[PDB]
Amino acid sequence: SGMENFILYEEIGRGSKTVVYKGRRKGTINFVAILCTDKCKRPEITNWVRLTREIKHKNIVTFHEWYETSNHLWLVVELCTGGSLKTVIAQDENLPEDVVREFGIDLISGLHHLHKLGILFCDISPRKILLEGPGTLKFSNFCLAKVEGENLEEFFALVAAEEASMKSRVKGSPVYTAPEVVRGADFSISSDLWSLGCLLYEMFSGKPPFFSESISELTEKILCEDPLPPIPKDSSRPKASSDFINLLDGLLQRDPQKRLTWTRLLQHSFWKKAFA
Ligand SMILES: c1ccc2c(Nc3cc(C4CCC4)[nH]n3)nc(Nc3ccc4nc[nH]c4c3)nc2c1
């Protein structure tokens, strides 16, 4: 029963109060990723499970099981041996536009599936995207995701109560936060599409469109700065196509009423009719 049913192999990743192992279900050849964490993370794990447990999609990490032992919580999910998108970007320094398009089609498929269900990812970022290998990107961390309109602090507090402080724990990365959210609005489908624009920009250029180590500077850049066009760190490499620049200009509109819609996003020339 429970974790008795799994072989644990090497550690493949770590986080705060967290270790991820490669594992295998005993009596099978089914390999899994097993996240082992402190019980204080029950709100984050419960949220991840409740949002994804019934999702079966190629571009979203599959849920299998979660279990509790005397001193740990355990989450058993799909194994992705290709690492994070953050590592891919750091290695190549910059990705060719054809690769960005291929990866982008994966990101679109997964995000479209979530938004259809009313699920906001809220912290779209390279470290929360895993690769199957060679490609096949998957959204892979739902601690901070939520259903549209939900108060996630309230949800975290309710989980913690059964067993204001939560306003901090629900904070993801500020780098990809849409301007309207910086200004106090709640996350939305449109703010996720902004973050997608930041991610596509970073995949091609190797760096996010708006970045500062300082928080106050980053806030001002998101609200004032115009980032186009993305230029690879390797200045000798090909420049962005006019279709790709046009796509980013639509996604990185600061005014969400002017931002590219899903319907226009899927029809955009950059995808070369991938969604026709
Ligand atoms: C090389 C190759 C693979 C990985 C890897 N693979 C995974 C991870 C998972 C699930 C465990 C919950 C997602 N499925 N596949 N993960 C990691 N690092 C990591 C570390 C703390 C994490 N907390 C959520 N996700 C995390 C991810 N590094 C890797 C480095």
Side-chain angles (χ1 to χ4, degrees):
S1 302
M3 291 309 307
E4 301 182 312
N5 297 342
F6 293 91
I7 302 294
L8 275 63
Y9 303 101
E10 76 275 15
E11 162 190 321
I12 62 183
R14 294 196 142 167
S16 185
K17 298 177 184 293
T18 302
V19 178
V20 182
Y21 303 92
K22 189 198 291 182
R24 173 180 69 82
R25 175 67 172 85
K26 294 187 184 171
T28 80
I29 46 64
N30 298 343
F31 285 76
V32 293
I34 301 173
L35 178 148
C36 176
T37 196
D38 194 288
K39 289 192 180 195
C40 71
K41 296 299 191 179
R42 192 182 301 275
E44 286 87 352
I45 301 295
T46 301
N47 191 42
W48 185 336
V49 171
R50 65 115 182 178
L51 292 168
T52 67
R53 66 189 312 162
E54 300 303 338
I55 299 182
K56 303 299 181 255
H57 194 273
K58 58 183 71 178
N59 303 117
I60 300 169
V61 298
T62 307
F63 165 84
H64 295 295
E65 311 281 357
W66 60 327
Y67 294 113
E68 181 165 0
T69 53
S70 62
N71 284 289
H72 298 87
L73 300 177
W74 304 80
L75 178 59
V76 181
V77 295
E78 178 180 5
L79 177 61
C80 304
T81 60
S84 70
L85 181 55
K86 179 203 71 181
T87 298
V88 170
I89 297 171
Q91 285 174 345
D92 297 335
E93 309 169 14
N94 60 263
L95 300 168
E97 183 167 335
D98 292 351
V99 174
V100 178
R101 180 178 14 255
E102 192 178 334
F103 285 179
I105 290 165
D106 283 347
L107 296 168
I108 289 292
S109 301
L111 193 62
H112 179 253
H113 192 80
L114 290 175
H115 286 184
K116 280 192 292 175
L117 292 165
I119 300 169
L120 306 179
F121 197 76
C122 294
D123 197 26
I124 295 176
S125 52
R127 79 180 192 97
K128 291 185 176 182
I129 305 297
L130 295 170
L131 282 77
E132 212 182 70
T136 306
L137 283 53
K138 312 187 183 250
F139 292 89
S140 72
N141 186 326
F142 288 79
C143 293
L144 305 183
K146 73 184 186 176
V147 182
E148 300 172 299
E150 283 186 331
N151 183 348
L152 193 58
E153 307 173 22
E154 173 186 333
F155 181 86
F156 277 26
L158 291 183
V159 178
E162 182 181 3
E163 277 64 5
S165 46
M166 304 301 93
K167 185 174 178 182
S168 163
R169 284 169 75 167
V170 294
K171 288 181 175 172
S173 162
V175 174
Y176 311 88
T177 305
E180 67 269 21
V181 179
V182 178
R183 298 202 176 200
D186 192 14
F187 298 101
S188 72
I189 282 170
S190 195
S191 68
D192 266 4
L193 293 182
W194 165 282
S195 303
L196 175 69
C198 294
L199 184 58
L200 294 169
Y201 186 110
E202 178 170 4
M203 287 165 62
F204 184 87
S205 80
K207 46 179 186 167
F210 316 102
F211 180 79
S212 177
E213 292 87 355
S214 157
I215 295 302
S216 286
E217 190 173 23
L218 176 60
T219 309
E220 199 177 36
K221 288 177 180 239
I222 289 165
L223 300 182
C224 309
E225 212 159 81
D226 295 320
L228 290 178
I231 279 288
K233 303 182 164 297
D234 190 344
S235 58
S236 62
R237 304 283 259 94
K239 290 175 183 179
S241 70
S242 60
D243 278 346
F244 185 52
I245 293 172
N246 181 271
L247 172 70
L248 294 178
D249 182 73
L251 289 172
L252 300 176
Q253 291 294 306
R254 287 189 291 270
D255 186 341
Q257 303 304 295
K258 295 179 169 192
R259 195 169 299 148
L260 199 59
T261 64
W262 257 114
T263 299
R264 300 200 165 101
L265 175 56
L266 293 164
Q267 302 167 340
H268 201 276
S269 310
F270 180 67
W271 307 122
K272 293 180 163 192
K273 299 175 185 181
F275 309 108

